[PDB]
Design a protein around this ligand. Structure first.
Ligand SMILES: NC(=O)c1cc(-c2cccnc2[C@H](Cc2cc(F)cc(F)c2)NC(=O)Cn2nc(C(F)(F)F)c3c2C(F)(F)[C@@H]2C[C@H]32)ccc1F
Ligand SMILES: NC(=O)c1cc(-c2cccnc2[C@H](Cc2cc(F)cc(F)c2)NC(=O)Cn2nc(C(F)(F)F)c3c2C(F)(F)[C@@H]2C[C@H]32)ccc1F
Ligand SMILES: NC(=O)c1cc(-c2cccnc2[C@H](Cc2cc(F)cc(F)c2)NC(=O)Cn2nc(C(F)(F)F)c3c2C(F)(F)[C@@H]2C[C@H]32)ccc1F
Ligand SMILES: NC(=O)c1cc(-c2cccnc2[C@H](Cc2cc(F)cc(F)c2)NC(=O)Cn2nc(C(F)(F)F)c3c2C(F)(F)[C@@H]2C[C@H]32)ccc1F
Ligand SMILES: NC(=O)c1cc(-c2cccnc2[C@H](Cc2cc(F)cc(F)c2)NC(=O)Cn2nc(C(F)(F)F)c3c2C(F)(F)[C@@H]2C[C@H]32)ccc1F
Ligand SMILES: NC(=O)c1cc(-c2cccnc2[C@H](Cc2cc(F)cc(F)c2)NC(=O)Cn2nc(C(F)(F)F)c3c2C(F)(F)[C@@H]2C[C@H]32)ccc1F
Lengths: 203, 204, 204, 205, 209, 214
């Protein structure tokens, strides 16, 4: 990673072992749950492309999703080569034809060229694709059970939505696919009600 | 976040991995108990508005409450935009939706300082309080002492429940009104205007 | 807290997650055993009043003891308003943290002459916590007596443990008085005025 | 390791206990999976040859793999002596058998820097690549999708095995071949020059 | 504790939350096992007497041993008040109650330690605490070095493990060597005598295996 | 131990709690496997003779092994006295005194004396010299705790060649604490894998021998 010294000078700090193990464990547990994308963005704060490639390589398993991310990176890197015809190229930003010297030289410059933050965008885009492919249920099938507390139903509704679109139609659909015991109370509250009101009434 | 450099300067650091994992595991265990409101504000020390979003996004599950927090933030930002007509920040800039980290750091380091990180944290704590209310099913009214329960355990449930609902003398009269008659009479034995130390020591 | 800057100064730092989690685990384990008091002191080293309120809000359960601590604080604070009448001078609610900003709290702690509103607030909290240690220990030193075969070490351990919550030569008289008659005679064979080492070595 | 002081001056520091324990627990758990190479390279950032030997020694078990690594180290060291004769370090110096920590630090901090830490790590990673191919239970040519295996679960085993062999366009040509006849037909139907995204979307059933 | 500033000045710091829980968990486990002394001296590295009191007050249970430690402190402090009588631009002569932290402030404790003629009121107090802790290790010792005999099947290594384990809690010598050979089970004891004198523990554990 | 200050100065630091607990857990679990030796040297990186004794003392159990290390230290110490006799006469001004074996072992030396020796220029690394003696004794302890010998490591009926070479070099790792190890490795292979190794030929890499039997 690249952090600033006590002398206010951007230097290349080594990737911390706590961040390495944290990222591997996140994938081992959450396994592409929507919160893995923010956890990757935060654990890769100011990371050179070499560091991003190291974090992705330590991912144990899920190799199918990794090739899909690799293809997404390849597509985005080529698009960078078109919109921007020394200048960094898509291969330099992805860490394939760039040295750590070149990556640091691009990041610690005035004006800077954040080859690490650009690469993190490409990674987050492909990772967002992986969360949609991994979403087991569609929002059209999230329907409140007979004895399911309304909080638990909304817990599944907005998680499924956070993975699919990784909209007032969600408001109509949430009531439309709700238990009748609660659906009557939801119509009682009337249109345009705070989610706090809906869940307070169906308690 | 924006911390204190050795030279007294306000420099921007990365969010700690330990602080990330701590916040995630706190929701996994305490699960919107009242004890999460101080834990969030303590792990969000000097946080930029962007750093606050990152923390709330790493929350695993409970995605119902998180939408409730979104709507709370959207309501508080509209009151900010109303009470500040038309570079001073607006509510979208405070919540980090239409602001960059450069802009957020700018407002936080200016003299005079506009603490957009602390103003956003204020709204978040509001929505988090409304969440703790909801995760408290039993109202303060239904907390009554069973005759086979000590008075210490009854006041425990009374003030733990009120802790969520509050986010007063009538609350103390409800503490006496909802006691088992074995100790309730001993509460009227002490009379009004007494310390909880005496109110618990006597019935013990 | 307010730690010493490595430039020889005094700068405000954020409350460590390790410090918070250590305090939460102490209450979840020892649960107001007397050893909880010195652990709170060490974990609140140079803490601002705001940092102290955060350590108390994170306490899981025991809310009956917490409201008691609030009343103790509201007592010690009204006391400061009395015998201290009148950067602005700190009042009782300023030291407690209910009407003082973190900047004002830092101002008093880093002033010269320094107004230690952090250590003052810590004294008020420690007193009420001592009331909790005494209340959570209904067993008195008078009822502590040695059983038939209970080793002398097992009886002395319970003796000074109960005495530690209640907080002296009267403890030495009560220690021998409440021993079982088999060892009590051996202690008299040692003679009056004996060390605890000798009193336990004899009754081995 | 040779870190950078907060005053900018590169300085030597002791190996972190967490860095050591992490490396041991990596081999205790992943045990020479393909992801063991990048974890070693990350935890050995800026390490000295002495520090590299300490990491490889704390490995409990897998001694056959470790001796195989040792022989790979000697082979690469014999080449370094021929291609780069010391009129200057030699192979044993970079390996850490005839050099001191002061000599290593001197090479790693010099106007003309001889990075014996990264050179030794290069040889170690090569031998560690051999261990991953050896511990690889199956070849990429023996991975075939079952009639009841979802196309995703088969692609997972495919690229997991491929990361072991390859320490490549022919990998995509083999993926379609070793599939169940149902999804295999749909893949040829999607047309060559497709994305794994589309190849999996078309076989969700 | 009194640590070194990055500049190089002796400055005071808070007791580490990690060092605190380290000491409490050592008592909860080893429970005055012989290795409790070294852990205390290490965790109290450069600690003020106030910090030394904090460590000794956070121990869970064992309150009887604590009063015995307090008595051992009072004895060593009174002897300090004897060997160094208080005489009435430097620091005042510390009395034993100051070294223990009963009648001294943190500023005074730091003043003695951070002074050109250093008065280490932390290391002297730590010597008193170590002396009283060694007493507690003897009391918690269940068996004596004279009652440690090799069981008929018990291997020699297992016997020598218990021998020096108990001796480490007692002493806190060639007669211990003879006591080791002589308390062994008879077959091995004859082998030890068959080795003769001038035997390293490596040799007498190698032959009797 | 002795660390390197931000201002570029060899200063003294307190032994780390995490470093201590890690060393205790290593002995509690691995318990004198040959990988405990490098873990000790790394955890005792630049440690004073005082810190070295603090680590060895906190070892719970194995007190018989610890006494064997103690006696091995005394042997190396008297040897240090033989080749480095302490000379009489008052210590030259500005120079450190001459250390003896008990000084290096920490029995008759203060922390400031150890610090002055290590941070001097020329530096006398009493910590590293003591560590050498400690490692030499720990090496004997690994040889004693070695269950079997390298000459008795013999491959089972269907035991794969890899599982046999693991036990082979593991045991040799304790004994050493050579081309004859090649003959000793081939000789003990079960008759199945034994023939395949002989068919390969001499001067064959371990990768070749293992890939062959497979
Ligand atoms: N265009 C490219 O080639 C390319 C190259 C790298 C690059 C460079 C240096 C070092 N590391 C890498 C990447 C980083 C990475 C990326 C990603 F999107 C997902 C990941 F997990 C890891 N990692 C590998 O290349 C390892 N790897 N190897 C294989 C193989 F098929 F060969 F077995 C497979 C991977 C796998 F993980 F990427 C996919 C399972 C399939 C960066 C971006 C690029 F665009
Ligand atoms: N007005 C807005 O939109 C809005 C946008 C952000 C913003 C910007 C950039 C990056 N992150 C965010 C937020 C941060 C956040 C806030 C919060 F209060 C609770 C949280 F947990 C997380 N996070 C998401 O927007 C993700 N998200 N997405 C969905 C959806 F339903 F769409 F799937 C759901 C979330 C969910 F987590 F917030 C709630 C489950 C429902 C800030 C404040 C705003 F006002
Ligand atoms: N006079 C006051 O109010 C008062 C306010 C604070 C203050 C200010 C800012 C932030 N935090 C606080 C306190 C800190 C605290 C103190 C204490 F002694 C024990 C504790 F545990 C926590 N904590 C709360 O205010 C939360 N709180 N809320 C309720 C309620 F009844 F409302 F539900 C209950 C608490 C509860 F925990 F303190 C008691 C269960 C009852 C300081 C001192 C004061 F004098
Ligand atoms: N030219 C050499 O010999 C040589 C020497 C070292 C060297 C120097 C100082 C300190 N450490 C070492 C190595 C480091 C190491 C390397 C490696 F590739 C795998 C590892 F795990 C460890 N470690 C040992 O030598 C210990 N060791 N000992 C034996 C024995 F057979 F003797 F028991 C066995 C080992 C074993 F681990 F290497 C193999 C099981 C067989 C460096 C590179 C060289 F080229
Ligand atoms: N001569 C003294 O007075 C004296 C005073 C302290 C002192 C000062 C400030 C703060 N703390 C202390 C001591 C520190 C301590 C010492 C020790 F050796 C063992 C320990 F564990 C703790 N500890 C207490 O004061 C608490 N304490 N209280 C009682 C009581 F019986 F009164 F309830 C009991 C203790 C108990 F733990 F020490 C013994 C069980 C009995 C230092 C040394 C002195 F010489
Ligand atoms: N020549 C010496 O005496 C001698 C003294 C120390 C010394 C000095 C100060 C502080 N610590 C020590 C040593 C350090 C140590 C060494 C070692 F090799 C193994 C270890 F684990 C620990 N440790 C003890 O003295 C504790 N100790 N005590 C006994 C007893 F027998 F008395 F019970 C036993 C030990 C035991 F652990 F060393 C052996 C079980 C037997 C240094 C080197 C020397 F040469």
């Amino acid at each position: 990673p690249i952090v600033q010294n006590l002398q206010g000078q951007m230097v290349h700090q080594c990737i911390s072992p706590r961040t390495l193990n944290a990222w591997v464990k996140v994938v081992e547990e959450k396994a592409f749950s929507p919160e893995v994308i923010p956890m990757f963005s935060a654990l890769s704060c100011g990371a050179t492309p070499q560091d991003l490639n190291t974090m992705l390589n330590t991912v144990g398993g899920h190799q199918a999703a990794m090739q899909m991310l690799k293809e997404t990176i390849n597509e985005e890197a080529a698009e960078w080569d078109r919109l921007h015809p020394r200048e960094p190229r898509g291969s330099d930003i992805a860490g394939t034809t760039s040295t750590l010297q070149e990556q640091i030289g691009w990041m610690t410059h005035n004006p800077p060229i954040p080859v690490g933050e650009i690469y993190k965008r490409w990674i987050i885009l492909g990772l967002n694709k992986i969360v949609r492919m991994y979403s087991p249920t569609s929002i059209l099938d999230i329907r409140q059970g007979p004895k399911e507390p309304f909080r638990d139903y909304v817990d599944r509704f907005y998680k499924t939505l956070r993975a699919e679109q990784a909209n007032a139609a969600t408001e109509t659909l949430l009531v439309q696919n709700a238990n009748p015991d609660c659906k009557t109370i939801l119509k009682a509250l009337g249109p345009g009600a705070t989610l706090e009101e809906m869940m307070t009434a169906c308690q």
